[PDB]
Design a protein around this ligand. Structure first.
Ligand SMILES: C[C@@H]1O[C@@H](Oc2c(-c3ccc(O)c(O)c3)oc3cc(O)cc(O)c3c2=O)[C@H](O)[C@H](O)[C@H]1O
Ligand SMILES: C[C@@H]1O[C@@H](Oc2c(-c3ccc(O)c(O)c3)oc3cc(O)cc(O)c3c2=O)[C@H](O)[C@H](O)[C@H]1O
Ligand SMILES: Nc1ncnc2c1ncn2[C@@H]1O[C@H](COP(=O)(O)CP(=O)(O)O)[C@@H](O)[C@H]1O
Ligand SMILES: Nc1ncnc2c1ncn2[C@@H]1O[C@H](COP(=O)(O)CP(=O)(O)O)[C@@H](O)[C@H]1O
Lengths: 470, 473
């Protein structure tokens, strides 16, 4: 059983002794600080609220377990058994905390309050920052959802330019990161952040997370097709690559099938095996069930172009109305090696320069999609902005002389839409002046209860691109 | 509850239909492929074996649940319901798999077999690579332990040069990455991996993982001390930073305390608050309870040097037997901002050039220690190298023309010690010739049971640096 008393940074165990005496309120906020990634997708807090923060999270056993761990860990008795016992006895172990948050899926410029945390009982002034470590873990779904959405923007731009529409956009970046992330839990969280923007995933774990914590009208959030790996090709032996290819497309004659082709020689495989020996099993394929050739090695841009040139010479190519080349509908390419947001852009630009439509290709990304991201990327931070001490509110902030950017916001905060349709975060309680319309932060958690939830379908709508909107 | 059927990459669901007919054995191995990280700590498999792979992992309802997900996920029926049913019925839901592995904590050069996986029932030829995805996640504890150990090597060399010894080394890189990792589960795994090399962590979840999955003679594998954060200083208001400092040091007068001092002006706080207004509360402190000053901003090297120059002018500095400057025993510094393996090296080097012992300093690291790592850094990779079909064994490998680095090993493999004491992985069954002694892999898993295991104390001994061994000897 997860114990919330053991789910914080160790040193926070000692902070109840460090706040100013006679402090009744500690109020903190989360932003993606300003310093590329101009706007961020707010996603993932609802998972954390439901899995770890709601309901009876304190028991007498958990207090005792925590007290024993801490005594050994610090080699001293510093744990606040009294404050935690108070939460148990007065609230049946429910956290006296109020959290307000922008709705999930909202796309917010950098440097704006995204959510705020405060204690609702003066005895629990120390609790606000106790849960900061858990609350701060929302950067991974925010950063995955944002980085994924930025790649969709690149794909959208180039698909529109080379085909005149956005058909198939949501299947152009497939999540293959299950094995490349650091844990089973990360895999489910990360895959669900990607599906805010796309429909294709092989990280099954993300499907259950969405069903359990968000929900969708459709049976499942993400979809997949049969595909080969090097073990299912190479197990036939080096001389029988062709037998493996033929066996696989015949087993999956009625659905799309992706077949890794670079086990020994990707160029030989496209020109001689797919393009001559097995060509007859490809041209006969249905439009709904194309062969997806997959190259897994070499320079990503160079390999994709040479594969397309090979296939254009063995299969009938047409020219679409924007004047770009298009493979027959039974044949596509997927590039799943070395793809991150930087190389994705180099590739589609490379394709366009060579007059190949982005219709012809999809991308797989694993580590690039889910593991190669850090809290530094959007400068996700949680800081205290307001305290009440001896009954007086004071505005609280950090302003390091060495770095201008690390400066934090002051006082009570609110998020508002400007007259021109942009966003603004009001400091120092100035949102109460009501010069800026309604605060977009809503109470999503109060005193152990989740008070407002969003479905995965609304989140997807909130996160849409303008290009899709237009 | 966790379901093994739903714990693989989607396309692996369809692979039982892609192997050559009449395949009875699939055999696969894991390596950190060759391509600054010459050797890797093998750490982490025992967690996965116990948490996810052992015991009764298949049920009637887990099969049903999986059948229903995959029908909607693929919009077709491709799930191998009868294969999974066979494991349920014949083995009471235990995996007919054998896994052999190098002992945990072993420090192994790149390009060597670290573990192998094969099915022990011909009917379950498809099972070996079904569990590839779960087993490949061992890259992460391996990579954390390896990268953590490479920073220890830097700290050890500099500390030894500066002080003539390694006293305190295991507290010099402290884990602060709980909030900076992608999840609660990652936090515990990565912090346990760091604790293979050091004693200091603030990510409590690492302690319970070690105790449950590995075990230690001691009550806990990791330790911590009281420390302030920006919220506990700034909450007093800007004009009262001195009151905050005095309250915190007084509250933890008899134990070591870390106090972040850059809320407003690191240099003013060291020189005028610590160095003057509150100096009397610092120089009275016990050797066992020093004040640790923590700067959290600006250039990491420049800030540490100027902080130290300031403290050397307000406090009595000594010179140690190697000629390096040493703060009084009640005063230390910790640098927790911008520390990764690259900047860690620039700091101790710049300290050494300015004649400051590494005794004076420790480092904290968070995202740098536990989040900024990928499977690409050590090329951790799982591949089939041997199959049997129609009773004939076959050596299998992948050899992409474009990339020589992606070439994989062939046939049955074994790990051996060379005549010079080095490691070599023998291919194509050649270990069976017995020209290199016995295979160093052990069966750690077979048919649903964990068959060999290591305590965290054994793993720590295996992962020691050469310099530490030399010091002991
Ligand atoms: C076969 C394609 O399937 C769907 O998208 C997928 C693609 C894809 C491939 C190449 C293209 O040029 C492209 O436009 C899309 O690739 C996948 C690969 C997988 O391993 C799993 C998948 O679900 C898809 C996946 O869902 C889309 O319906 C697409 O319109 C159709 O061409
Ligand atoms: C007060 C120090 O505690 C221990 O090391 C730690 C240090 C440290 C600091 C400065 C130095 O120059 C140094 O050599 C070490 O810092 C910590 C900071 C934390 O937030 C938590 C900790 O557990 C330590 C932590 O455990 C060691 O036992 C060291 O001997 C002692 O000086
Ligand atoms: N069926 C598939 N379709 C597209 N890309 C795939 C794929 N399977 C794997 N990949 C890409 O390759 C990565 C997995 O790497 P592998 O373990 O297959 C190759 P290696 O690094 O071990 O030599 C994934 O993150 C994904 O980007
Ligand atoms: N008590 C402490 N001692 C040393 N370093 C610490 C520390 N607390 C935090 N850090 C460093 O600062 C990182 C966390 O930064 P914070 O979240 O406190 C400020 P910011 O990330 O919003 O700019 C940790 O990964 C760690 O490297």
């Amino acid at each position: 059983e997860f114990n919330i008393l053991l789910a914080t940074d160790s040193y926070k165990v000692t902070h109840y002794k460090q706040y100013p005496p006679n402090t009744s309120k500690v109020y903190s906020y989360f932003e993606c600080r300003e310093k590329k990634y101009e706007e961020t997708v707010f996603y993932g807090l609802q998972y954390i609220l439901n899995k770890y923060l709601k309901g009876k999270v304190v028991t007498k056993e958990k207090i005792q377990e925590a007290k024993d761990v801490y005594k050994e860990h610090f080699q001293d008795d510093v744990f606040n058994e009294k404050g935690w016992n108070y939460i148990l006895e007065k609230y049946d172990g429910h956290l006296p905390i109020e959290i307000k948050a922008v709705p999930e899926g909202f796309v917010i410029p950098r440097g704006n309050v995204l959510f705020t945390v405060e204690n609702t009982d003066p005895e629990c002034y120390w609790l606000t920052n106790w849960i900061e470590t858990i609350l701060v873990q929302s950067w991974y779904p925010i950063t995955v959802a944002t980085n994924s959405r930025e790649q969709k923007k690149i794909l959208a731009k180039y698909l529109l330019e080379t085909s005149g529409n956005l058909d198939g956009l949501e299947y152009k970046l497939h999540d293959f990161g299950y094995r490349g992330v650091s844990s089973q839990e990360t895999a489910g969280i990360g895959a669900s952040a990607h599906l805010v923007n796309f429909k294709g995933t092989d990280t099954v774990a993300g499907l259950a997370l969405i069903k359990k914590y968000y929900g969708t009208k459709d049976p499942v959030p993400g979809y997949s097709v049969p595909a080969a790996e090097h073990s299912t090709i190479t197990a036939w032996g080096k001389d029988h690559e062709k037998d493996a290819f033929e066996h696989i497309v015949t087993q999956f004659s009625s659905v799309p099938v992706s077949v890794v082709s670079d086990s020994y020689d990707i160029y030989n495989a496209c020109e001689k095996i797919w393009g001559e020996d097995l060509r007859h099993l490809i041209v006969s394929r249905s439009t709904q069930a194309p062969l997806i050739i997959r190259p897994d090695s070499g320079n990503p841009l160079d390999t994709v172009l040479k594969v397309l040139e090979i296939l254009g010479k063995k299969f009938p190519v047409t020219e679409n109305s924007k004047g770009y080349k298009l493979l027959p509908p039974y044949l596509r390419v997927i590039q799943g090696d070395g793809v991150d947001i930087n190389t994705l852009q180099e590739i589609v630009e490379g394709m366009k320069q060579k007059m190949w439509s982005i219709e012809n290709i999809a991308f797989g990304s694993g580590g690039g999609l889910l593991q190669k991201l850090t809290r530094d990327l959007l400068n996700c931070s949680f800081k205290c902005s307001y305290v009440v001490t001896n009954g007086l509110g004071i505005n609280v902030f950090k302003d390091p002389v060495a770095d201008p950017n690390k400066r934090s916001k002051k006082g009570r905060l609110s998020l508002h839409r400007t007259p021109a349709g942009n966003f603004v975060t009001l400091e120092e309680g100035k949102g109460d002046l009501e010069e800026y319309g309604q605060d977009l932060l809503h109470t999503v958690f109060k005193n152990g209860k989740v008070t407002k939830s969003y479905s995965f379908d609304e989140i997807r709508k909130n996160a849409q691109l303008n290009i899709e909107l237009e």
